[PDB]
Ligand binder design. Structure first.
Ligand SMILES: Cc1cn([C@H]2C[C@H](O)[C@@H](COP(=O)(O)OP(=O)(O)O[C@H]3O[C@H](C)[C@H](O)[C@H](N)[C@H]3O)O2)c(=O)[nH]c1=O
Ligand SMILES: Cc1cn([C@H]2C[C@H](O)[C@@H](COP(=O)(O)OP(=O)(O)O[C@H]3O[C@H](C)[C@H](O)[C@H](N)[C@H]3O)O2)c(=O)[nH]c1=O
Ligand SMILES: Nc1nc(=O)c2c([nH]1)NC[C@@H](CNc1ccc(C(=O)N[C@@H](CCC(=O)O)C(=O)O)cc1)N2C=O
Ligand SMILES: Nc1nc(=O)c2c([nH]1)NC[C@@H](CNc1ccc(C(=O)N[C@@H](CCC(=O)O)C(=O)O)cc1)N2C=O
Lengths: 269, 271
């Protein structure tokens, strides 16, 4: 019978399924539900469908997963909201790419940077009917480095999410894990509608904040930020004072300071 | 000889001037620079001008203050931007109503609540030519209570600022005080343009955030926010789960929950 279903995408889903096959369950005991963006082609992330094809793993529908008693249903960047009443099993888990209760919703590789954070986290939690609302099983908090981009932060969510899965999965399989209700205080949420991918920079902001408005949108597979109709590939912040409210466009880079006058180099594409 | 000027308003300016007359200088050694808004009347805050009237303290201008060699200039919610160059004295100080380097700029009783903070602070710093950018002498960090309004947070800035001013004034007079470069990391700023007093609430937010979007604007002397064209006087965030995305108007209050399902009681204004 199917003991475990991985729903989702990218190296966190593929590498977690690989860990299951080596340590826990046989191919005939697992199933996948790939994301709508999965066409079975490895690119800048591995395709869960391509892995399932190579490893003789069955694809199932959400409708089928509902009917499988005792299934461990694990979302690793699954693209769909499930209704937990529809499942016969109550063994429903998600890895969320933020330090819950902060930064529920989407674009979590943008929202912490854009909102001036110096740390983020990955959080293993029970699925309930809300978005990212379910009881916490485990959390790992890690730094946002001062010149990290959304892409760097994303790759960190991928590696820390994969680590936290491997840590907890035996205890999930043995039903010997605790869960804790999320706090109401410090709970925060961002929907697709809350992020403009073509963000217009506000320069009436600190250097840190102008930096953050650039680097939060550096994720080349999706987009790069533009200054004066010119793509930016990298932003570097230093504590060097060059004066307040500077803007100097050179051939290959902009030099920028905000209200507090610290040096930003925005590298052109 | 004027040794010390207090430029600004409200109980921080008045009670700081009081403590100066009480422990450090005589009336003839001190002058005030009031805000454009000061019409010598006590209300929800005391009037600096009214205090200067009662205690025979002279009003000076900025132009006067610039020429006063050796003067200690203290901005306590002063309304005027100041160029350091213009001053004979380099003993220019500001109490800023945030935990610098965060929440430089304006409406610091609103911005931390609206941006989901559970702490704020008061920072005593040297004035430089930037907005709240100058080197830090001392800082007191205090909690934003879960149901604090912007008024509550402003009242805490006044009390903790008055305390920080008192704890620090001696070493400012002796000129035996340290200052420190503000970090560039975690530096943030809001200008007046960045706050829409009348911003519509986004209900596609957590209960904490809907609660914050109401209470950040509860400050009755300036405004109350509204839901369905009724003014709200208090918001209360509970830990009670009532279901995701609830909204119910009752006679005296709105029952609201966000994307995480916690009950908020928003109390209506009621003549
Ligand atoms: C779609 C998109 C993504 N990105 C970046 C920032 C995003 O955080 C990151 C990941 O994109 P994404 O859509 O895979 O993920 P996120 O939007 O981070 O996560 C949501 O969607 C996932 C598929 C899951 O359903 C998850 N539970 C959701 O929170 O890629 C862009 O910069 N521009 C874009 O237009
Ligand atoms: C003007 C105004 C103020 N308020 C609240 C929030 C503010 O933080 C608080 C105090 O307002 P305020 O006019 O004193 O100014 P703030 O914007 O707090 O402070 C600026 O102006 C002061 C006079 C100083 O120059 C200070 N350094 C500045 O940062 O009252 C409202 O809720 N609505 C309003 O319309
Ligand atoms: N019930 C449930 N809770 C979850 O936390 C959860 C699941 N299911 N399933 C897997 C994963 C799904 N994550 C997401 C998160 C957001 C959207 C999404 O469509 N967001 C819309 C808002 C839609 C709405 O308002 O209902 C958007 O515009 O952001 C989709 C899937 N997940 C945990 O990761
Ligand atoms: N040089 C200096 N630094 C300071 O930090 C400082 C002073 N002077 N003077 C006293 C006080 C004045 N504070 C302020 C702060 C903001 C505005 C203001 O109207 N700001 C506008 C935009 C100004 C700009 O863009 O340059 C706004 O809309 O926010 C006025 C007075 N102050 C420390 O408090």
């Amino acid at each position: 019978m199917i003991k475990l279903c991985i729903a989702g995408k990218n190296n966190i889903a593929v590498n977690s399924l690989e860990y299951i096959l080596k340590n826990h369950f046989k191919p005939d005991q697992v199933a996948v539900i790939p994301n709508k963006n999965d066409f079975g082609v490895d690119s800048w992330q591995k395709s869960l469908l391509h892995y399932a094809f190579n490893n003789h793993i069955k694809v199932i529908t959400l409708e089928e997963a509902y009917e499988l008693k005792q299934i461990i249903f694990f979302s690793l960047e699954f693209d769909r909201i499930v209704k937990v009443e529809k499942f016969k099993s109550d063994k429903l888990f998600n890895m969320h790419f933020s330090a819950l209760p902060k930064y529920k919703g989407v674009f979590t590789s943008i929202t912490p940077i854009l909102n001036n954070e110096v740390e983020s986290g990955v959080t293993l939690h029970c699925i309930d009917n809300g978005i990212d609302t379910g009881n916490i099983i485990d959390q790992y908090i890690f730094p946002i480095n001062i010149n990290d981009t959304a892409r760097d932060l994303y790759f960190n969510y991928l590696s820390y999410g994969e680590y936290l899965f491997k840590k907890n999965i035996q205890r999930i399989i043995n039903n010997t894990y605790e869960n804790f209700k999320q706090n109401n205080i410090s709970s925060s949420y961002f929907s697709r509608q809350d992020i403009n991918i073509n963000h217009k920079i506000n320069f009436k902001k600190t250097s840190f904040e102008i930096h953050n408005q650039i680097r939060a949108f550096i994720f080349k597979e999706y987009q790069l930020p533009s200054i004066n109709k010119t793509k930016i590939i990298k932003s570097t912040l230093t504590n060097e004072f060059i004066g307040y409210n500077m803007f100097e466009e050179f051939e290959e880079y902009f030099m920028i300071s905000g209200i507090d006058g610290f040096k930003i180099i925005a590298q052109k594409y």
